[PDB]
Design a protein around this nucleic acid. Structure first.
Lengths: 176, 113, 80, 80
RNA sequence: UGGGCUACACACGUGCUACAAUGGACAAUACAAAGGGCAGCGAAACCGCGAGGUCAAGCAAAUCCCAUAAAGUUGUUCUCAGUUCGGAUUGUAGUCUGCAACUCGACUACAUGAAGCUGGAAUCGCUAGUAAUCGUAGAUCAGCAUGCUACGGUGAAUACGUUC
């Protein structure tokens, strides 16, 4: 819980001083992290979705929820109820461990890494990071990766504004 | 994995180093000799200290993303100055004064009959 | 957490070998080698080629000087 | 010529014409047929009407255009 | 003086290089012929990884130089894939000739590493020192050859026969 200790000690004080919070309960915190992988080619080959689920489970540490089509779309040849994604929600210690790992061990493994988008905030204090290749994560061996596919990592925060969310993530150590 | 790019485990160390962008046989040999490692030895059967020395030598060779960005900057500069080379890069035609009446496929793509 | 559905997961030390920089965190890598932590108990260690304290973008280190301008290359090449 | 031991080539008449009115900031357009003349840093900010075969195409010299020939910015052939 | 003859959605002819293991890379080590050289051919040495540069020997030729042939042989290595095949394209750094290599020269170094896995209908050459394969020299020429004209090294298969 090194990252959590940093948040309790340094980030809390820095952020509260910067934004003039009358109470500590106003200090933003990372509510959850949702790691999603949309596998639309599972329509054509379910083994792709199975491999994606296994890789996501290795990355995150817990079994993913398989997400199914909410509606049928002819162009995609998608029928309602067909499994076309995987999702993991991380909270608490696992969330913090994954976050520090992503900041330190994983993100620098990005090829030609030059920081993460600073404008990728929903407008209400939540940040979505699109990783373009799973090989980034240290838990995956490229030998067993039949196909390389990305992920969406949604950091959901209690910050009301992109400015506060940016300050929180920067203090945590996100490049920008 | 050296320079942020994985290199073939089976291959010999020098041939695997060539897979790094910006590394060619001459510079793979120079790197391997600077960092005293045998050419015959495969990357899989390679000492951790040997791998570290290889990384230390390689980091200073200006390879991978830095080299790609440098080349792209040069191409963009010649395109922006409106040079003859820039116009030909924009039009996707041979730049070094070749003949386009025939034999320009590597620049013009597949044949459009 | 439910029992039997999640993969084996345990504390490890991620060790950036370049800078010999250790930090403890959870992961399912299960590397054999064990290095003692500041706490007495050892945990399996994960060798790391690069890390947040060794990446040029993170550290700000400039490996190579910026490309010279056209005037500067002209002058340095032709000696004028 | 191209060899380093020889200095970058440039027409003497073109060079002296450019040097003329160097002090004055009201630099004018210089008509030239010398597509072969090299571009020196002295040319930056100048306007050369370079002959391309039938007409003088105006070319404005900037810093990034140093080291190229004046013909590289005066295309000779017309296509589409 | 400058441009064009070097254009480029394309079709045809003639060639060069390949698609690999009868091969690629690296190390050592053999054997030719026919030609050219005056302000031209330019050894030795030293400088650079190299293209080349510095000075400079011999020679108007069975004398000196171009000019060490390569394929080949003997070893090490790779190990059946778009690869250690291939080397097109592109960036950077240079060498030379020429006054001057942008349109529009050749060559070197570093880096990149495209198509291409033996090619449909069709169609061509060759009867022996031939085909195939490997290099070498000359004219034009300041510079520039995959073209042309000559030279030699290795060196096949097959011809029953004349109905079509």
């Amino acid at each position: 819980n090194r990252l959590k200790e940093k948040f309790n000690t340094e980030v809390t004080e820095n952020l509260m001083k910067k934004f003039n919070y009358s109470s500590v309960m106003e200090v933003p915190k990372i509510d959850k992290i949702v790691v999603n992988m949309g596998v639309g080619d599972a329509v054509q080959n379910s083994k792709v979705l199975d491999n994606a689920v296994e890789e996501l489970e290795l990355i995150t540490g817990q079994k993913p929820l398989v997400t199914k089509a909410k509606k049928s779309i002819a162009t995609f040849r998608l029928r309602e109820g067909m499994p076309i994604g995987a999702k993991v929600t991380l909270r608490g210690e696992r969330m913090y461990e994954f976050l520090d790992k992503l900041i330190s061990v994983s993100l620098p493994r990005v090829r030609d890494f030059q920081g993460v988008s600073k404008k990728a905030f929903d407008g209400r204090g939540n940040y979505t990071l699109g990783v373009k290749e799973q090989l980034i994560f240290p838990e995956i061996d490229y030998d067993k990766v039949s196909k390389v596919r990305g992920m969406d990592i949604v950091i959901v925060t209690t910050a009301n504004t992109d400015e506060e969310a940016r300050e929180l993530l920067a203090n945590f150590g996100m490049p920008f | 994995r050296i320079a942020g790019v994985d290199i073939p485990r089976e291959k010999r160390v020098v041939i695997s180093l060539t897979y790094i962008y910006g590394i060619g046989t001459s510079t793979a040999q120079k790197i391997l000799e600077e960092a005293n490692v045998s050419a015959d030895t495969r990357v899989k059967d390679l000492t951790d200290d040997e791998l570290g020395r290889i990384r230390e030598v390689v980091d200073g060779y200006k390879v991978e993303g830095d080299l790609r960005r440098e080349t792209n900057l040069n191409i963009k500069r010649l395109m922006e100055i409106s040079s003859y080379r820039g116009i030909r890069h924009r039009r996707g035609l041979p730049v070094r004064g070749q003949k386009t009446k025939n034999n320009a496929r590597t620049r013009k793509g597949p044949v459009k009959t | 957490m439910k029992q039997g559905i999640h993969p084996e997961y345990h504390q490890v030390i991620f060790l950036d070998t370049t800078t010999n920089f250790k930090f403890l965190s959870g992961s399912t890598k299960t590397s054999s080698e064990m290095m003692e932590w500041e706490d007495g108990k050892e945990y399996p260690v994960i060798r790391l080629d690069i890390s947040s304290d060794s990446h040029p973008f993170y550290t700000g280190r400039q490996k190579f000087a910026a490309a010279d301008g056209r005037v500067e290359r002209f002058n340095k090449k032709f000696g004028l | 010529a191209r060899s380093i031991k020889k200095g970058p080539f440039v027409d003497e008449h073109l060079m002296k014409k450019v040097e003329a009115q160097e002090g004055s900031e009201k630099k004018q357009v210089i008509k030239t047929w010398s597509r072969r003349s090299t571009i020196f840093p002295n040319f930056i900010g100048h306007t050369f009407a370079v002959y391309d075969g039938r007409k003088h195409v105006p070319v404005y010299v900037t810093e990034d255009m140093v080291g190229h020939k004046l013909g590289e910015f005066a295309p000779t052939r017309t296509f589409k």
